[PDB]
UniProtKB/Swiss-Prot annotation, chains A, C:
This is Dynein light chain 1, cytoplasmic. It comes from Homo sapiens. Residues 67-89 are annotated as: Interaction with ESR1. It comes from the Eukaryota. Induction: Up-regulated by ATMIN, PAK1 and estrogen. There is a cross-link at residue 43 (Glycyl lysine isopeptide (Lys-Gly) (interchain with G-Cter in SUMO2)). GO terms for biological process: apoptotic process; DNA damage response; intraciliary retrograde transport; motile cilium assembly; negative regulation of DNA strand resection involved in replication fork processing; negative regulation of nitric oxide biosynthetic process; negative regulation of phosphorylation; positive regulation of insulin secretion involved in cellular response to glucose stimulus. It is found in: Cytoplasm, Cytoskeleton, Microtubule organizing center, Centrosome; Chromosome; Cytoplasm, Cytoskeleton; Nucleus. Belongs to the dynein light chain family. It holds the Pfam family Dynein_light. Keywords: Acetylation, Activator, Apoptosis, Chromosome, Cytoplasm, Cytoskeleton, DNA damage, Dynein, Host-virus interaction, Isopeptide bond, Microtubule, Mitochondrion, Motor protein, Nucleus, Phosphoprotein, Transcription, Transcription regulation, Transport, Ubl conjugation.
Swiss-Prot record, chain B:
The modification N6-acetyllysine is found at residue 11. It is linked to Charcot-Marie-Tooth disease, axonal, type 2O: An axonal form of Charcot-Marie-Tooth disease, a disorder of the peripheral nervous system, characterized by progressive weakness and atrophy, initially of the peroneal muscles and later of the distal muscles of the arms. Charcot-Marie-Tooth disease is classified in two main groups on the basis of electrophysiologic properties and histopathology: primary peripheral demyelinating neuropathies (designated CMT1 when they are dominantly inherited) and primary peripheral axonal neuropathies (CMT2). Cortical dysplasia, complex, with other brain malformations 13: An autosomal dominant disorder characterized by global developmental delay with impaired intellectual development. Some patients show signs of peripheral neuropathy, such as abnormal gait and hyporeflexia. CDCBM13 is associated with variable neuronal migration defects resulting in cortical malformations. This is Cytoplasmic dynein 1 heavy chain 1. It is found in: Cytoplasm, Cytoskeleton. Belongs to the dynein heavy chain family. The gene is DYNC1H1. Cytoplasmic dynein 1 acts as a motor for the intracellular retrograde motility of vesicles and organelles along microtubules. Dynein has ATPase activity; the force-producing power stroke is thought to occur on release of ADP. Plays a role in mitotic spindle assembly and metaphase plate congression. Dynein heavy chains probably consist of an N-terminal stem (which binds cargo and interacts with other dynein components), and the head or motor domain. The motor contains six tandemly-linked AAA domains in the head, which form a ring. A stalk-like structure (formed by two of the coiled coil domains) protrudes between AAA 4 and AAA 5 and terminates in a microtubule-binding site. A seventh domain may also contribute to this ring; it is not clear whether the N-terminus or the C-terminus forms this extra domain. Disulfide bonds: none annotated. It comes from the Eukaryota. Homodimer. The cytoplasmic dynein 1 complex consists of two catalytic heavy chains (HCs) and a number of non-catalytic subunits presented by intermediate chains (ICs), light intermediate chains (LICs) and light chains (LCs); the composition seems to vary in respect to the IC, LIC and LC composition. The heavy chain homodimer serves as a scaffold for the probable homodimeric assembly of the respective non-catalytic subunits. The ICs and LICs bind directly to the HC dimer and dynein LCs assemble on the IC dimer. Interacts with DYNC1LI1; DYNC1LI1 and DYNC1LI2 bind mutually exclusive to DYNC1H1.
Length: 89, 48, 89
């Protein structure tokens, strides 16, 4: 297992869901190679788990400014991949 | 030997801080989760 | 005005709405040098004009998979800059 340490760069969250995000994003990165598809996989899996709807981006060079639901916003780094995921809707 | 001793001592000294860091984390959570409800609470009406 | 041709990849929203996005995005790119500030500009002015809640992503490479309400999705390129703007809230 490639130990890609997670550095979560912002979160209005509980910790358990943040670590779920880290683990499943690591799983998606291990499973797929397309940033759009990584975000897609993570978005469906949280939509299934903690009820819709989120918005997930996976990439290297991107900047974001959105409005999210309270206690439902995370943004972290795995390896060289920044992953944002916020619930709004 | 004493350089390794310095390194181990410095690392274990570092290890102490995470407890108080978690304490301030708990302070963060107590502020935010309660303040959401508190801001949703009050209004100009409700003569209480 | 540097005629950065807005080659528009994905679009579920009207053409005047497309052109408003393109004009004020040229505005955001020509006014700001940080992609985060560009996205903040565009989301804020869409929140002012087309009501909350907007979500703007400005970047050079990223993978996005989000749920948007109908008639409220754009994903285009200004120069090499990819811009994804969608409403969800």
């Amino acid at each position: 297992m490639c130990d890609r340490k997670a550095v979560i760069k912002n979160a209005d969250m509980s910790e358990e869901m943040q670590q779920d995000s880290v683990e499943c994003a690591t799983q998606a990165l291990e499973k797929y190679n397309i940033e759009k598809d990584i975000a897609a996989h993570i978005k469906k899996e949280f939509d299934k788990k903690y009820n819709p709807t989120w918005h997930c981006i996976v990439g290297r060079n991107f900047g974001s400014y959105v409005t999210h639901e309270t206690k439902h916003f995370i943004y972290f780094y795995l390896g060289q991949v920044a992953i944002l995921l916020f619930k709004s809707g | 030997k004493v350089n390794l001793k310095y390194d181990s001592w410095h690392k274990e000294v570092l290890s102490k801080f995470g407890q108080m860091l978690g304490s301030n984390m708990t302070e963060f959570h107590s502020q935010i989760s309660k303040s959401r409800q508190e801001l949703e609470q009050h209004s100009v009406d409700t003569a209480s």
